[PDB]
Amino acid sequence: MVGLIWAQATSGVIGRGGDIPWRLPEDQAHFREITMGHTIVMGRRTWDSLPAKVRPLPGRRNVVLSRQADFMASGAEVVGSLEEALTSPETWVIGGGQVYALALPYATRCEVTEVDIGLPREAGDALAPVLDETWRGETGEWRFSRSGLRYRLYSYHRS
């Protein structure tokens, strides 16, 4: 099972200027409960964006995709291809834009957090992949963040 997990503005934006363009602590907790104890796969830019205090993300096997054959990072398994990245029976792809697109055809689950923030797309933004008719989803009830954004959870699957 390969799953994709991301948080996106309604607009589809997941990243800008190398950052996630909002704060949503509740989403982190959700992310942790999905990924804990599993292999996670991420592109090199997403690895770089992890705060040093949690690079690698603890309790998870950190797998980092890079085309740099000699790229190394403490606590991460650097691999040069997706095939090398997806060998664990349960694998969660945690970003970013490039790697979601790369892994999408291999995926049968998506766990999405929608953030109700006004954030029109800008050129060069990292974006969420588009889920077509092959996917079924269940939409969670809107929740209200400690800071004030409304957000909700989607679970998508295809068999």
Ligand X SMILES: CCc1nc(N)nc(N)c1C#CCc1cc(OC)cc(-c2ccc(C(=O)O)cc2)c1
Q: Three-state DSSP class for 58?
A: coil
- Rounded to an integer, what distance in angstroms lies between the CA atom of residue 100 and that of residue 129? 6
Nearest to 62 by CA among 70, 126, 44, 113: 44
Q: Which residues bind ligand NDP (CB under 6 A)?
A: 6-7, 14-15, 18-20, 43-46, 49, 65-68, 71, 80-81, 94-99, 102, 126
98 binds, among Na ion, ligand NDP, ligand X, none (CB under 5 to 8 A by kind): ligand NDP
Stretch that binds ligand X, among 25-33, 61-69, 126-134, 135-143 (CB under 6 A): 25-33
For residues 127 and 12, is the Cβ–Cβ distance under 8 A?
A: yes
CB of 133 to ligand X, least distance (A): 23
Residue 49 is labelled as binding a ligand: no
Q: x/- contact string, 92-111, with ligand X (CB under 6 A)?
A: --xx----------------
Indicate which single residue of 140, 145, 155, 157 sits in contact with Na ion (rule: CB under 5 A): 140
Q: Which residue has the tokens 């797998």?
A: 63
Contact (CB, 8 A) for 24 and 31:
no
Per the CB < 8 A criterion, the answer to whether 64 and 76 are in contact is yes
Q: Which is nearer to ligand X, 6 or 78 (CB)?
A: 6
What span, in angstroms and rounded, lies between the C-alpha atoms of 139 and 100?
Answer: 21
Contacts of 28 (CB under 8 A, 6+ apart): none
Our finding on whether 31 is near ligand X (CB under 6 A) is yes
Smallest gap from residue 144 Cβ to ligand X (A): 17
> Annotated binding site: which residue ranges?
5-7, 14-19, 27, 32, 43-46, 60, 65-68, 80, 94-100, 113
| Binding residue positions for substrate | 5-7, 27, 32, 60, 100, 113
